[PDB]
UniProtKB/Swiss-Prot annotation, chains A, B:
Changing E18A: Strongly decreases enzymatic activity. Almost abolishes detoxification activity on methylglyocal-adducted CoA. It is a lipid-anchor. The modification N-acetylalanine is found at A2. Deglycase activity does not require glutathione as a cofactor, however, glycated glutathione constitutes a PARK7 substrate. Induction: By hydrogen peroxide and UV irradiation. In pancreatic islets, expression increases under hyperglycemic conditions. Expression is also induced by sulforaphane, an isothiocyanate obtained from cruciferous vegetables. The modification N6-succinyllysine is found at K182. Its main location: membrane. The gene is PARK7. This is Parkinson disease protein 7. Multifunctional protein with controversial molecular function which plays an important role in cell protection against oxidative stress and cell death acting as oxidative stress sensor and redox-sensitive chaperone and protease. It is involved in neuroprotective mechanisms like the stabilization of NFE2L2 and PINK1 proteins, male fertility as a positive regulator of androgen signaling pathway as well as cell growth and transformation through, for instance, the modulation of NF-kappa-B signaling pathway. Changing C106A: Abolishes enzymatic activity. Abolishes oxidation, association with mitochondria and protease activity. No effect on chaperone activity. Reduces binding to OTUD7B. It is an enzyme of class 3 (hydrolase).
Amino acid sequence: MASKRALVILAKGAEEMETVIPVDVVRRAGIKVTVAGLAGKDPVQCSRDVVICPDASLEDAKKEGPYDVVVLPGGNLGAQNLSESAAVKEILKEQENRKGLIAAICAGPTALLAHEIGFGSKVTTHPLAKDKMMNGGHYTYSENRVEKDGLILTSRGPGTSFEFALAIVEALNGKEVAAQVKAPLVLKD
Amino acid sequence: MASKRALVILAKGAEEMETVIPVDVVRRAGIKVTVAGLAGKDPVQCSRDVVICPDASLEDAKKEGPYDVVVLPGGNLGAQNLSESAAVKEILKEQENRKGLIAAICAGPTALLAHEIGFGSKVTTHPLAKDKMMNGGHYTYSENRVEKDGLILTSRGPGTSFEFALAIVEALNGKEVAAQVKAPLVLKD
């Protein structure tokens, strides 16, 4: 059938590596990615001052769902902005309700906590975000570089972003497509 | 003294992972990075359609040199644009003449060939860019993930971008700073 679709939610203070790596690798898989700006259509200042122009506002992108995966980058301030957003809450609850994949990296998974998403799952985060994520004991913590418990797919940091992205590709399109996308990247794996 | 400075030259068709990873990691080292747009000040459409807004035009950024490192991302079309640019030629020749570091990744090193930079050095590239780089036998080819022969620092692909970036940090600011920057990244190394 038609190609699958990914929504990447881009907020001020996002970790730009954790944004670009998944966008790029998921597009290499032939999956249609929408980089959606939380605040609107305007360019977004990431944590290390890379400025990325989103494909659409979140307001507009939401209308074009549903998506096969919703992706939440990290960066402490980006994740905080995701956590505070009513629009993000709605999107994640819809995705959960419809049994769609949700993928979050670094501080990103803390937005799952904020929005009460995926309780009872095994999750990982950046080491520095563990205490925030674990407040209340609603998840079981993992130190795996990528963790996947059903439809909740989490990962740890900039340096796990390729593994994270490839896990999203594998979850959507299978092992063989992921292996094919992986090879030209020159990963040490 | 004052902090060191890096120039990252951003052309249409650049590999956005190979652009953002070095920018971010070098900024984590406290080094001042200028993302300079080859074509001007306008946003740049990268190879996988991430759009990045440069900090300055190359025309303007050149004026603010010299730089402790000049960084050339890859992406086949980005590298081709770098290779065709008289402005890039001038910058690289100046940097070479002044015994400053030049760092290039993936297809990026092929711009060194185009501009006659660093002949007689050991270099690596993306596997698919080897034949282009080696036309004429002006360099000695390496399969190391990062290669450094004096002031010519090369690397292979998206999946070597962290190693590449950290090697730039080490070359400028030393092993200890590089190790400090590395740890929070959650690299498998």
